[PDB]
Amino acid sequence: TQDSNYVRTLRQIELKKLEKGAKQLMFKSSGNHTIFVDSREKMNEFTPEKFFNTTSEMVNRSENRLTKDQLANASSIMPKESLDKKKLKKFKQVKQHLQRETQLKQVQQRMDAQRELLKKGSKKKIVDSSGKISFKWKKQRKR
Amino acid sequence: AYVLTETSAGYALLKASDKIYKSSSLIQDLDSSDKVLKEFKIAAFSKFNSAANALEEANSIIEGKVSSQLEKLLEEIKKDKKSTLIVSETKLANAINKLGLNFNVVSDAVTLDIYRAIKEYLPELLPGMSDNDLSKMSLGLAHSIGRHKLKF
Amino acid sequence: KVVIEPHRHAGVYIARGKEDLLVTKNMAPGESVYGEKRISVKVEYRVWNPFRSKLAAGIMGGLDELFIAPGKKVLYLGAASGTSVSHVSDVVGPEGVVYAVEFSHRPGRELISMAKKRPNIIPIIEDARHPQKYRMLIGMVDCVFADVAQPDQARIIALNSHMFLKDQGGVVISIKANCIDSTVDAETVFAREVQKLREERIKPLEQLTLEPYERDHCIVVGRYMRSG
Amino acid sequence: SLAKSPASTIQILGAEKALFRALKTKHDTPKYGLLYHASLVGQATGKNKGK
Amino acid sequence: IKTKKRKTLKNLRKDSVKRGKFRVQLLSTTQDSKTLPPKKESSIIRSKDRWLNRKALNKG
Amino acid sequence: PNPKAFPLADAALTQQILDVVQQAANLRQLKKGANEATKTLNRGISEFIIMAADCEPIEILLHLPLLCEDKNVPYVFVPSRVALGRACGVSRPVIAASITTNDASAIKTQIYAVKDKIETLLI
Amino acid sequence: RKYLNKLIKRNSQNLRSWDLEEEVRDE
Amino acid sequence: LRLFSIGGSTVVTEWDLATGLPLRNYDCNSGVIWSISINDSQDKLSVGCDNGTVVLIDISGGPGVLEHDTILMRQEARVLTLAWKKDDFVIGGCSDGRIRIWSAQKNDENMGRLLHTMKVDKAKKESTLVWSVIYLPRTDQIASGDSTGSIKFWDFQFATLNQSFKAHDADVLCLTTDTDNNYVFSAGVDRKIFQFSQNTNKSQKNNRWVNSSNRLLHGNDIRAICAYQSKGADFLVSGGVEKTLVINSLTSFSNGNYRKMPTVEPYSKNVLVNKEQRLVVSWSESTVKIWTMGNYKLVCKLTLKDDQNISTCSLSPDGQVLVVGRPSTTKVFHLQPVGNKLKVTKLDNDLLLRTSTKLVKFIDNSKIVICSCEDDVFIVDLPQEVELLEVTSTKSSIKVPYINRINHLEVDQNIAVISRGCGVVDILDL
């Protein structure tokens, strides 16, 4: 019993750290953005650059399509590598938190099944095809 | 004829040079601006007094039926045995139809564009009654009535 | 320590630094309503959650013409807990106002307290199907944003935009296709709904899918033309 | 939020420091908490205080 | 030949070019869309009529 | 039956739900009681929540739908807590119970069928 | 017109560096 | 009176009878629609949809108005047939093989709560699916055409069957009764019509429905059967994939003369001849064929490549002139013989395009007189009109909204005749 309390405590810590990491950090969107244009000729004559009145780079960019009129790094040191290395490493830190949490979950699954084998009842040890065993209790009311 | 609209201040009646044909012509002449404002500024206003409970009861019992400020409104309105009045609610319409002026009232016709125009130009009809920013006591009414509807 | 960047939609800023965030200003500092963080650079700023607001993933999903402009007046339908409403009051500021309605009671109480905290809000806590008991209050709004999960989105939005929305008004609707149908393609449900609105006199500009933030959800934006 | 907490955590709502120390170091978690000053648990004697 | 011809006919009838990540779309003619009830779904026709012409009952 | 307890299953869905409950307790996948059910919502493993309708006062289990809305868990009221306890396997009246998750049980398919019909009933 | 297009390219690169990647946009 | 129709998709159209075109396409929200039925007193029509769901759309406010009223409690598999007991209970017959009763009331706790299911017994190697339920009001009962081939009389209070008939050897698709509910007529896919009766003393006393007889009539199967019974009439009318209609006496079903209606009735004609150049013109949906004869040969092969309406009325005078009139648009074509083959050229006229032309008539090879859908008279050359007398509307003219419309236009060199469904003829000097 003390063992499974320990494991569950660790898992809950990690679960909350995962939540806070995702809260802190932004992920890029990816969704279909379909325009409704009436006439077939102007539909054929569509260009994003005029429509969102921007430059093709800023067109494919989809978190800020700041216009040409809106348009009309030296702060962060070495932004080509240091900034991007930091970006990726924040992502990896959230991912690593996630794997820690799933593993602790499984360890608690195994431990919880054992504790309940210990309790009571009239069990039956059934064996699956794959090699995995399982237990199935007799149909009885605990009193 | 006449039109009735309710505010966060009080009830307003406006004279109209005749109706439904006024609805047609008004949306046809694109008539929610200063031109229609000066066409029909005001005929009459009747406040409810600025006592917070008296507001909340006037407003709740206008959500249900007809209030006493509406009563004093209805004796002050009439000039003819027959009078026909637009109301944007069928409930309030049939209530005042069965109520005591004995004059015909009409329900939700195509006079939604009329009340849209009035309800736009209406704070510029506050020159007619009281040209002050009513948006405060609008918020105050919203807060007051929500706190009414909730038990609290 | 942090760089700000303006956004195409005015009133929307992005903090670029060691970590990127989507952020607005604030009107009443020294507070945080829903446990969200903030950043203060000097002036306060407050971030959203596109995992918690629909409108956020509307924005940062890349959205060309949203019509909520800083000075304006914005109706909000289906404001549970008002977190997105707080964001709406931040993005309008004092010269614009927001008209947030909710049906039930517990998001209503939270709405009421947050409306106590903020100026820009008037809350309507009456039912959303019937627009009369607050045509008494609401005044001739500019834009309408609505998320209701009740399947009568066409009807509620038709009635509310008829009664309140300015001509050439802006309307932005959310949809959960899994609430509407839950049999067929979510795309098909979306096309069915844009046909509803196009019958109901709203000209539809844009459709957008919030694929990596919610499941099966759509945002549809359009103009409102020549009605009463 | 107090309404939504379960019943065990209402038992252990006062003694969190001893709780998380005991949980983390595999020791027997504290058992009265903040209810200890109620008149009933001030009326019991020993294991009956815990129960 | 004629295969490519009604290929070109279908590609006239079509109403969307995938503009990279973005897509384009159009809205139908208002007169027809108002004047006549909308199309059947092939799902419904297949289900009902296939059920009636199942082979379990020896139709024919 | 209170209008408090809104999404209420009927006879047919009630039988299917209590059939999955019986299977789950034989395999020991079931958390019995309202405090225990709140705990497993909090740990965030639970499959779905089955509540009684006639526990009077109703509020003591009414604290669960706010958690289920927050966490997106499906939940269903069934009519009688005597029946829920019998189907659950104990000697008592049980007013809430909670199917927990073990992705390689032998009742994963039946759980999903019931959980899908519940989510339709909510939605 | 070149004064427009030069200023166009100007802030473009001033934002192109702020929010993009190539080798990192995969991982 | 108004006509509501389920076209196969997710709308419910209610038709303006006068223009013969949809007064309003309502969009019921929940998914594709499989069946429809009004309640009693016509205030509330309910559609059942293959989300499994049942929607109530109510009708107050006369024409052109509908409102999404209510959605009763949903369930898994699709709903095939509806009936209403009264204003109060919606009986649905649905594809699992089972019959459900919802409670469509107002102001009761049990509003919209599915409160009974009743499972029809299933077949061996298949999914049964209850095609057809109806309510029978003298006794309490409901009755059930089953995809096995059965007919099961469930009684409603206590919701548990009384009678069970393995009626006929393939799946039932229609049911109906008579006004006294002495006769349930069931109509199959194996082309039979069974009559189950209750008219005798013991049968009315103790509810026993007895399958008095059957009769087969049809060629292929039956898809709709309807009874009617009043001081003038007792007939039931059947129809199916054998494209016809079959009328029977009702009470004397097995002792009585039927009548097999003709398949096609030429009231709206579909072929017109040209004595000039020895021509025949036919037109089916969006397609136009012309032959000549003398042997007979093809002449012209028209596919209206932009026409989603059915070609209503077409004309071709002497010479090479053709007009095709749609209830939405109208088009004009000129022909040219280059031998056995012909060349076509569509012309242009906005008066043809935006104006819906029901009836077309040629004065000569020059000019055309038109009756447009709103009973309007047009005179065109290739915007002239003549005004008409209007009769005062009587009661049934108010009821049926096209009895005062324009039936027939007949043209001569200068003289025309208008006929109106009330039976009016006017003569026109154009």
H315 and H322 Cβ atoms separated by less than 8 Å = yes
Which pair of tokens denotes residue H347?
A: 């012309």
The CATH number that applies at residue F85 is 3.30.1330.30
Dmax over CA atoms of chain H, in Å, equals 81
B125 and B12 Cβ atoms separated by less than 8 Å = yes
Q: Which of C199, C223, H372 is nearest to E34 (CA)?
A: C199
Q: Which of A8, F30, A17 is nearest to D29 (CA)?
A: A8
- Give me Rg for the CA atoms of chain G: 12
Helix (H) or strand (E) holding B6: strand B2-6
Report helix, strand or coil for C55.
helix
C210 and C53 Cβ atoms separated by less than 8 Å = no
Evaluated on CA atoms C175, C176, C182, C185, the torsion sign reads positive
CA B97 from centroid of its chain's CA atoms: 16
- Tell me phi and psi for residue H153, to 5 degrees: -95, 100
* Residue C93: HSE in the Cβ half-sphere, 13 Å Cα cutoff: 9
Which pair of tokens denotes residue H148?
A: 């096995």
Distances from the Cα of G10 to the Cα of A62, G14, G21, H215, H392, angstroms: 20, 7, 19, 89, 79
Report helix, strand or coil for F1.
coil
Q: Determine the Cα–Cα distance for residues H336 and H339; give it in Å rounded to an integer.
A: 9
Q: Determine the Cα–Cα distance for residues A11 and A5; give it in Å rounded to an integer.
A: 10
- Taking residue H160's Cβ as centre, other Cβ atoms within 10 Å add up to 10
F53 and F79 Cβ atoms separated by less than 8 Å = yes
- Taking residue B99's Cβ as centre, other Cβ atoms within 10 Å add up to 16
Report helix, strand or coil for F37.
helix
Q: Determine the Cα–Cα distance for residues H260 and H243; give it in Å rounded to an integer.
A: 11
Question: For chain F, how far is it from start to end, CA to CA, in angstroms?
Answer: 21
- Asked if the peptide bond before residue C50 counts as cis, ω within 30 degrees of 0, the response is no
- Tell me phi and psi for residue H417, to 5 degrees: -130, 125
Beta-bridge mates of residue H409: H418
- Tell me phi and psi for residue E33, to 5 degrees: -60, -35
Q: Determine the Cα–Cα distance for residues D29 and D23; give it in Å rounded to an integer.
A: 6
User: Any CB–CB contact under 8 A between C16 and chain G?
Assistant: yes
F27 and F89 Cβ atoms separated by less than 8 Å = no
Q: Which of A121, A106, A124, A94 is nearest to A22 (CA)?
A: A94
Which chain F residue shows the shortest CA-CA distance from H76? F117
Q: Which of H102, H100, H143, H146 is nearest to H120 (CA)?
A: H146
User: Any CB–CB contact under 8 A between A32 and chain C?
Assistant: yes
Q: Which of H384, H385, H395, H388 is nearest to H424 (CA)?
A: H388
Residue type for position H229 = Q
Which of F45, F89, F106 is opposite residue A142, by nearest beta carbon?
A: F89
Residues in chain E closer than 8 A to A36 (CB atoms): 25-27
Distances from the Cα of H218 to the Cα of H13, H214, H239, H258, H261, angstroms: 31, 13, 8, 12, 11
Q: How many helices (H) and strands (E) does chain G have?
A: 1, 0
C contact residues 102-141, partner B, Cβ 8 Å cutoff: 105, 108-109, 112, 115-116, 119, 122-126, 132-133, 135-137, 139-140
Inter-chain Cβ pairs, chain F and chain H, closer than 8 A:
19
Provide the 8-state DSSP code for C94: T
User: Any CB–CB contact under 8 A between C3 and chain G?
Assistant: yes
**What is the rounded (10 degree) CA torsion for C208, C212, C213, C216?**
60
Burial pattern H164-197, b for ≥16 Cβ within 10 A else e, equals ebebbebbbbbbbbbeebbbbbbbbbbbbbbbbb
Q: Determine the Cα–Cα distance for residues C156 and C159; give it in Å rounded to an integer.
A: 5
Residues 6+ apart with CB under 8 A from D23: A5, A6, A9, D29
Q: Exposed (0-12), middle (13-18) or buried (19+): which is A22, by Cβ within 10 Å?
A: middle
The count of domains in chain F is 1
Report helix, strand or coil for D51.
coil
What was the experiment behind these coordinates? cryo-EM
Provide the 8-state DSSP code for D29: P
Q: Determine the Cα–Cα distance for residues H99 and H120; give it in Å rounded to an integer.
A: 7
**What is the rounded (10 degree) CA torsion for B108, B110, B116, B118?**
-80
Residues in chain A closer than 8 A to E17 (CB atoms): 43-44, 46
Which chain C residue shows the shortest CA-CA distance from H67? C155
Q: Beta strand F48-52 with F75-78: parallel, antiparallel or unpaired?
A: parallel
Q: Determine the Cα–Cα distance for residues F23 and F37; give it in Å rounded to an integer.
A: 18
Residues 6+ apart with CB under 8 A from C191: none
Q: Which of C228, C172, C168 is nearest to C197 (CA)?
A: C172
Distances from the Cα of B44 to the Cα of B16, B71, B109, F109, H161, angstroms: 12, 14, 23, 71, 69
Inter-chain Cβ pairs, chain A and chain C, closer than 8 A:
83
Q: Determine the Cα–Cα distance for residues E48 and E44; give it in Å rounded to an integer.
A: 6
- Tell me phi and psi for residue C30, to 5 degrees: 65, 30
Residues in chain D closer than 8 A to A5 (CB atoms): 23, 29
* Angle (nearest 5°) at CA H69 between C170 and C84: 35
- Can you give the resolution of this entry in Å? 3.9
Residue type for position H193 = I
* Angle (nearest 5°) at CA H92 between H87 and H96: 165
Order of strands across the sheet with H33-38? H33-38, H44-49, H54-58, H67-72
Provide the 8-state DSSP code for F27: T
**Structural domain span for residue F28:** 1-123
CA F9 from centroid of its chain's CA atoms: 11
Q: What is the 3-state secondary structure (H, E, C) of chain H?
A: CCEEECCCCCCEEEEECCCCEEEEEECCCCCCEEEEEECHHHCEEEEEECCCCEEEEECCCCCCCCEEEEEECCCCCCEEEEEECCCCCEEEEECCCEEEEECCCCCCCCCCCCCEEEECCCCCCCCCCCCEEEECCCCCCEEEECCCCCEEEEECCCCEEEEEECCCCCCCCEEEECCCCCEEEEECCCCEEEEEECCCHHHHHCCCCEEEEEEECCCCCCCEEEEEECCCCEEEEEEECCECCEEEECCCHHHCCCEECCCCCCCCCCEEEECCCCEEEEEECCEEEEEECCCCEEEEEEECCCCCCCCCEEECCCCCEEEEECCCCEEEEEEEECCCCEEEEECCCHHHHCCCEEEEEECCCCCEEEEECCCEEEEECCCECCCCCCCCCCHHHHHCCCCCCEEEEEECCCEEEEEECCCEEEEEEC
Q: Determine the Cα–Cα distance for residues F77 and F63; give it in Å rounded to an integer.
A: 13
Q: How many helices (H) and strands (E) does chain C have?
A: 6, 12
Tell me which chains share at least 3 CB pairs under 8 Å with chain C: A, B, E, F, G, H
Residue type for position D14 = G
Report helix, strand or coil for C11.
coil
